[PDB]
């Protein structure tokens, strides 16, 4: 009775140190929750995809010449096809239900910090947030600044948190108050951090 | 080139002739959900909310045993075409902004890893740091390359500089990537 992620099954093939690599990827693509769901099972030899099972095609297709004997043999067996055709629901749709109650519910509130760079740049570090969906805005005395604003790309930390640095080039006049405005799905109302000239 | 709101790999199965080595993991939106330890035969979850689920290590063992058969067949049909060593791209950064005294985590992203055989070590003043060191599995890339991230728990200090040391077959000598506060 514990729930379990269902895996996609590799099909056995018919019939400086040197290295030979093989990868099998059971890819699941989801759009609009479970409205559109596509399965793409890729077999890769070294860095070349040789054979594929695209659920939108409903058949093994040889991507390279190496995937040829495998796409002909696996396609000649209705057992294999009957199974890969189901995998979109058995693997992709099944596991998304598990994600709905766990990964697609993960929320880590961002940590917003402002610091001048060590010619006049304020750096707003938005660290340790999840999901990716983030919106950062810069204000100089409640007026939005865009022209002098540059961001880094989204930084994946690898431990299930993201990081982003949003920089603003400014000319400080005494009494100026700059505000980093961060919006994120884990927040009740936007985070507002102030920096005073 | 596919567009989707979410993307999962309900099977990043990997097998190599070098070792021979294997790797079984599940990914969700580019993050590692778990890996099966093929030697200990156990599923190790990477996100603690996932520990409520089970994943039979024998699912992974059967898949890697099939990949081993396919690898051998592909070595035959390709006339022994071996992998070409790629040049890894290393970047050292921090989990949070640096404040001396306040604990932080030094992050070492090693990108463009191919074949998936690499050594990621940490140095402080030329000596290896072994405690507080952890790492992700090889995480897949769309171009069938891999990346791996290594971590080091730190207490920053003005007179303490660190390095991320990477050893790969595609590098002439160890790539050292410096970080300092």
């Amino acid at each position, epitope marked *: 009775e514990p729930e*379990q992620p269902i895996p996609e099954q590799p099909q056995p093939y018919p019939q400086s140190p040197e290295d030979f690599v093989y990868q099998f990827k059971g890819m699941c693509y989801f759009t609009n929750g479970t409205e559109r769901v596509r399965l793409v099972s890729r077999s890769i030899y070294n860095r070349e995809e040789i054979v594929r099972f695209d659920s939108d095609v409903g058949e093994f297709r040889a991507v390279t010449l190496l995937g040829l004997p495998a796409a002909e043999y696996w396609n000649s067996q209705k057992d294999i096809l009957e*199974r890969k055709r189901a995998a979109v629901d058995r693997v992709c749709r099944h596991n998304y239900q598990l994600e709905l109650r766990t990964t697609l519910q993960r929320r880590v509130e961002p940590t917003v910090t402002i610091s001048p760079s060590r010619h006049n740049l304020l750096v707003c570090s938005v660290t340790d947030f999840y999901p990716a969906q983030i919106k950062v805005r810069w204000f100089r005395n409640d007026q939005e600044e865009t022209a002098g604003v540059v961001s880094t790309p989204l930084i994946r930390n690898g431990d299930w948190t993201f990081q982003i640095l949003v920089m603003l080039e400014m000319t400080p006049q005494r009494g100026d108050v700059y505000t980093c405005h961060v919006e994120h799905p884990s927040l009740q109302s936007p985070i507002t951090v102030e920096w005073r000239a | 080139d596919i567009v989707a709101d979410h993307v999962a790999s309900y099977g990043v199965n990997l097998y190599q002739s070098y*070792g021979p080595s294997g790797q079984y993991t599940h990914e969700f939106d580019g993050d590692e959900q778990f890996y099966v330890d093929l030697g200990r035969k156990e599923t190790v979850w990477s996100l603690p909310v996932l520990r409520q689920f089970r994943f039979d290590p024998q699912f992974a063992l059967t898949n890697i045993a099939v990949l081993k058969h396919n690898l051998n067949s592909l070595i035959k049909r390709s006339n022994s075409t071996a992998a070409t060593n790629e040049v890894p791209e290393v970047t050292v950064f921090s989990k949070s902004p640096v404040t001396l005294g306040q604990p932080n985590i030094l992050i070492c992203l090693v990108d463009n890893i191919f074949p998936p055989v690499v050594n990621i070590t940490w140095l402080s003043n030329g000596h290896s740091v072994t405690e507080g060191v952890s790492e992700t599995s090889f995480l897949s890339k769309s171009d069938h390359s891999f990346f791996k991230i290594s971590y080091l728990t730190l207490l920053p200090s003005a007179e303490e500089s660190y390095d991320c040391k990477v050893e790969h077959w595609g590098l002439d000598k160890p790539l050292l990537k410096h970080w300092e506060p």
Partner: antibody
Amino acid sequence: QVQLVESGGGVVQPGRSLRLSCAASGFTFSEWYFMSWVRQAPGKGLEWVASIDTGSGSIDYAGWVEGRFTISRDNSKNTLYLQMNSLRAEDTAVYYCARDIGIDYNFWGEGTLVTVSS
Amino acid sequence: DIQMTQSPSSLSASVGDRVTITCQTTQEISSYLNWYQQKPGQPPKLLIYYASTKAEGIPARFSGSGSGTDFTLTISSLEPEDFAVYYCHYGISKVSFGQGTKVEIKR
């Protein structure tokens, strides 16, 4: 050709010990394999004894074994071993050696009878 | 360990008949259930893997279905050479086998 050949069977008195061997040929243990000992008492069903990962040396035994039997391998010799101690009439069975059970293009040996008798 | 029970323990059927043997496991195993066939004085022979995929060279009359804890082996039209004991199986390292179902031929 690929095959597994069991040897070491015959008669053995109760309480004594016996070591079965299964020699591999046409493949090498260093390619990482699950090698298993499955036994079958006359007229009874298949009963798994133990498995060994030739690579990492990982071992699994059936819950009934409880230390009496020891599975081992030698990748240099390409041979699987089953060391049985304190033999009883219950252990009279055909002992089969198998490679990666449940996966296509894999093999089982012809077997070797082990009779526990005075 | 995972345990497996087959139904029935034995059956008798005529040539041309559709034979159905079930296997039930104590735990969910996705579609990682295999079927073996053993004829007298021979080692077991893999018939089906992945619950429903037939092994290379296995006659088309042999088929499988099921997922999770409940599986079925079907012989759509029985032949006299199908006299044998059939076993469900799970596990490459921790190996479980069902108790076996003896198939006898009504002639």
